[PDB]
Amino acid sequence: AYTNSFTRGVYYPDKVFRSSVLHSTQDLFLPFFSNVTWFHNPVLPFNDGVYFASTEKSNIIRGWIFGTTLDSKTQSLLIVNNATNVVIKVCEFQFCNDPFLGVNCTFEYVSFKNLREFVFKNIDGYFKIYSKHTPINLVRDLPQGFSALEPLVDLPIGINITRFQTLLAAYYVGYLQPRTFLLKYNENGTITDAVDCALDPLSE
Amino acid sequence: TKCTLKSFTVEKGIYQTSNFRVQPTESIVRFPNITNLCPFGEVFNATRFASVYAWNRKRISNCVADYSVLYNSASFSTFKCYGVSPTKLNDLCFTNVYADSFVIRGDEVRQIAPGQTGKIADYNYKLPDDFTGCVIAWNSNNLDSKVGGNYNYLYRKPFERPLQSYGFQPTNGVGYQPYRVVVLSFATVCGPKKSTNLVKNKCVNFNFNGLTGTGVLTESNKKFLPFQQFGRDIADTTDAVRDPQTLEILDITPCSFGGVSVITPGTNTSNQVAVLYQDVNCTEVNVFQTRAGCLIGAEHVNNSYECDIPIGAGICASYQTSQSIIAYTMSLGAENSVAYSNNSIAIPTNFTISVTTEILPVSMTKTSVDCTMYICGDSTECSNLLLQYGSFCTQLNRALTGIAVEQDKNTQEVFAQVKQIYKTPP
Amino acid sequence: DSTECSNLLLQYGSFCTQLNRALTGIAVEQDKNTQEVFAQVKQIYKTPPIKDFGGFNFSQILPDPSKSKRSFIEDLLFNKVTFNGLTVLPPLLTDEMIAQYTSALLAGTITSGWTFGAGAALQIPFAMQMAYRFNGIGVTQNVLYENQKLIANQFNSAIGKIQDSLSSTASALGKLQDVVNQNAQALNTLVKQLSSNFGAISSVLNDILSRLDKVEAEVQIDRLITGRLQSLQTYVTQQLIRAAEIRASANLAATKMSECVLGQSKRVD
Amino acid sequence: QIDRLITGRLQSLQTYVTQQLIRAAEIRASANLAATKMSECVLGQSKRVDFCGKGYHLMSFPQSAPHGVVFLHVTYVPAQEKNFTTAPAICHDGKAHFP
Amino acid sequence: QIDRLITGRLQSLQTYVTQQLIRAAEIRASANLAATKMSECVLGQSKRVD
Amino acid sequence: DSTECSNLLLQYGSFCTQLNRALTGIAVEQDKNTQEVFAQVKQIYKTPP
Amino acid sequence: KFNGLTVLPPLLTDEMIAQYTSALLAGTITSGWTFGAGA
Ligand SMILES: *[C@@H]1O[C@H](CO)[C@@H](O)[C@H](O)[C@H]1NC(C)=O
Ligand SMILES: *[C@@H]1O[C@H](CO)[C@@H](O)[C@H](O)[C@H]1NC(C)=O
Ligand SMILES: *[C@@H]1O[C@H](CO)[C@@H](O)[C@H](O)[C@H]1NC(C)=O
Ligand SMILES: *[C@@H]1O[C@H](CO)[C@@H](O)[C@H](O)[C@H]1NC(C)=O
Ligand SMILES: *[C@@H]1O[C@H](CO)[C@@H](O)[C@H](O)[C@H]1NC(C)=O
């Protein structure tokens, strides 16, 4: 099943302040009005990097795994929200194939009512995580609006990724693409509107 | 000015001659509060080590390499380096930072050489055939070894056991007595980036993290988001930064600079000159401030005169009465109240013929350039290379010939409007 | 201000000095253009205290001590048009001096006809200056006097419509606005070109000098010098062409001052 | 080495020819103006105020000059004046007379 | 190798566009003159000798 | 129309865009020149037959 | 000065220009505007 992504999934492309300016960049973004797959789990492709979001209120969507195999053979990302905060490991996890929370190694780290949104991308050997949170009215799909995602963490871990999966109530997946964007930074240094230049002839 | 124009005589005017450019008064370096240091005491303050026939090897990554502390540890039983030196290694970084340790006899300096030798090295405690980094040892026979000795010996690749462990004791001579061997080697782990105090309202050299520059750092009102580090202007030039040790936003305004221009009367009349520092504020440099910049050596005169040497923004300068350079607001012409009323007219009673000269150029010097001789004169070697650029010399010589023919056209267009060469009457 | 780059730029010789000379010629051309348009009058003629111009009403176009001295229409016009080694330079004549010339030209034109171009300004009543401008278009001057208030009402009304035409839309000033935008666009293009790599390892000059030893850095910096210098030659060439385009407009405006303000040109349209 | 000298000398000569094209267009603007001054003020009498020197125009005489031309514009300039009382028209037998 | 062709072709195209800008000023000077002839010499009778 | 070449031409930055912009400036100006010359008339007049 | 740079002479000599300014001037004196408008 699929739903329209609307104008969602834009994120701050760099750690820079700019104000009252229409800056433009080519980077891995979720294309405007792209198909986001809907889910309520199988190992998914990672492609050019991922947009992930969940309409949630139970906080049962709780973790992510990434890698090539994403299991046993090589150092593989394990990310969990443990009710303190985010917790991260990268071990060669030969762990259970479909875990649920109660209703070798090279790095380790510690940090519906809502839509919580995220982006995961891998560039040059850094792994990047972004996020945003909002209250919502709509239940079946993403709410039609605009609100940019902000960096959380910025990890020098060097691991290869081609697949990902999620750990145990509704969520959405989309893939980033090398689109060029125009970004409307306001007086207070926030992105407040955008153009996916490739979308239509007016957008070009 | 004489050197600027490559001439000893200088005509009356104003001439740009140099840049005024305020130099950085000191240098600033800023990085985050130094944190997450490498726990080197996990090797360098350990109570013991495994025997040289089973010598330990480990990573040392994801942490700040506090080598300045081990560099001051002159109480070490031994130290050396081979892929680096301890004066630089405290500022260096490792691409895949690593460490090693073992228990061995004091003779194990023969085990520290690349492709190491002797019983501990042949057992397992040997250095790589192309070794790198630095090595240390700690005084185990002083207190970590009891009078009966300890398993700090071995006999026959790095950390690979064809080998077995053995005893050594603090009652032995310096080569036989036990010591706690240690190693470190070559991103994974970098030395601490030291920071200066921060300085404001002065032209200063700076670095924030890796953002180098030179500027006048001033505190600012701007609201960065918490993840934002640097600001930019509309043309993408950096306009402000966040300090990494307190949450302050500083405008990086430029260090003051501008063209030096020299006002001179003609050198045939005087050798006095006055200097305009373009858009400078005079406190930074008689002295006079103008909208064009700081003017030095010109007397300000409060009267107004027609513009002799133009400075800008209504200011002009001249050489006048003992004489000196003066600067004044230019006269546009004398005032005149035309005596208008609804029933008055002024009619001229008399006239003058006037014979106003007017002067116009009509031709350049007709010119042609042999681009083959200009670029490559007499060289066949160069002339062949010029042909790899194709049509350019043909196009240049054509363009100049277009100008050349146009000069004869211009001259005929002006004068040759007359069909017959009229003689005067006699 | 990198010394390592500055020494390499000396090997290109007189290129910098002839670029600075070319731009300095353009700077002088602007003071010269402005002189040739406005400074056509040798004396600053000034407006009389009485305003009895037979019914005509110049109060929107004459000076105002509450407005700088600019007229009401000059204030509309001044409202509707709107550090990398680059510097702007001031005009020789400030806007308060330009306003004195456009006042002098206008107060001459009102009180004295064309005569203030031909010699000394000679006063003539405004209702008579219009007769000797109707005769200039082959209308017998009694067609003014028998209609003097009707003609004044049309002139005063049309001046009122110019205040509205300028107040409502900037589109009439599109030429001036475009000239300002073109210069800002050229300067922005020239600044943005500092960020371009030109086949070098980085466009940050100190970054090259941090990554590389001198003989490698020399070739990398020589690319940036070549790219930036070609971008400067491009900008200066474009500004020389643009300056000739403005100078052609300045010669035309100077000619409209000379024939069309200071006289009555019979050149149709 | 010679590729550097060729590229430099060639970029320098393109700069010179570019300067001369633009300078030649400025001199053509002046030659077309001079041609016009000659047609209107030597071969004619211009009514274009201040086109042929200050004053009302009478005639002009060209004189040649190195790479250019000089005009001696002969102009009538009015030079002494009297204030007078004036009227746009005058009555007679109830009819208005005009000059 | 390709950077030499880009360098050459870009400098060649900049030469062409520079030349066309200067030529368009020569043509615009002629078009302003032509428009001036149409205003003064067609739409009216001109006393401007020759 | 080579990708491997265009990726280098991007490293020269704004040169190509300002060439397209300069020639587009020439192009529009010809339509202006032709309207300056001929479009001086508010109506299409016709003769008597 | 030998480096392929050359200055070329004008088509009209300065004496020929002085014949045209003589012709223009002798026209202007003897015949007014008439020598532009034909005979
Ligand atoms: C979350 O993880 C940390 C260690 O990573 C642990 O100390 C903490 O107890 C965990 N939180 C909860 C609620 O158990
Ligand atoms: C800077 O210039 C202004 C005038 O532009 C002047 O008022 C001010 O005093 C100057 N500031 C300093 C610190 O000299
Ligand atoms: C007119 O001026 C001349 C000097 O230019 C003078 O000699 C002559 O007498 C004047 N004529 C009258 C009528 O004043
Ligand atoms: C002139 O017109 C303005 C409005 O356009 C008005 O304020 C002023 O009173 C008028 N004065 C005369 C003399 O008509
Ligand atoms: C004309 O008369 C007025 C006084 O009514 C006087 O100010 C003005 O200077 C006179 N002009 C001449 C040329 O005499």
PDB file of C-alpha atoms and ligand atoms in Angstrom, chain B residues 349-352, chain D residues 80, ligand 3:
ATOM      1  CA  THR B 349      19.557  96.023 -26.049  1.00  0.00           C
ATOM      2  CA  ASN B 350      22.777  94.577 -27.543  1.00  0.00           C
ATOM      3  CA  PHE B 351      24.640  91.352 -28.440  1.00  0.00           C
ATOM      4  CA  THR B 352      28.055  89.818 -28.878  1.00  0.00           C
TER       5      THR B 352
ATOM      6  CA  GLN D  80      23.044  93.743 -22.290  1.00  0.00           C
TER       7      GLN D  80
HETATM    8  C1  LIG H   3      26.900  97.316 -28.228  1.00  0.00           C
HETATM    9  O1  LIG H   3      28.164  96.747 -27.757  1.00  0.00           O
HETATM   10  C2  LIG H   3      29.391  97.342 -28.324  1.00  0.00           C
HETATM   11  C3  LIG H   3      30.582  96.609 -27.712  1.00  0.00           C
HETATM   12  O2  LIG H   3      30.397  95.201 -27.947  1.00  0.00           O
HETATM   13  C4  LIG H   3      29.378  98.848 -28.053  1.00  0.00           C
HETATM   14  O3  LIG H   3      30.530  99.463 -28.659  1.00  0.00           O
HETATM   15  C5  LIG H   3      28.135  99.462 -28.695  1.00  0.00           C
HETATM   16  O4  LIG H   3      28.170 100.900 -28.508  1.00  0.00           O
HETATM   17  C6  LIG H   3      26.891  98.851 -28.042  1.00  0.00           C
HETATM   18  N1  LIG H   3      25.683  99.432 -28.627  1.00  0.00           N
HETATM   19  C7  LIG H   3      24.768 100.081 -27.910  1.00  0.00           C
HETATM   20  C8  LIG H   3      23.539 100.579 -28.683  1.00  0.00           C
HETATM   21  O5  LIG H   3      24.898 100.273 -26.703  1.00  0.00           O
END
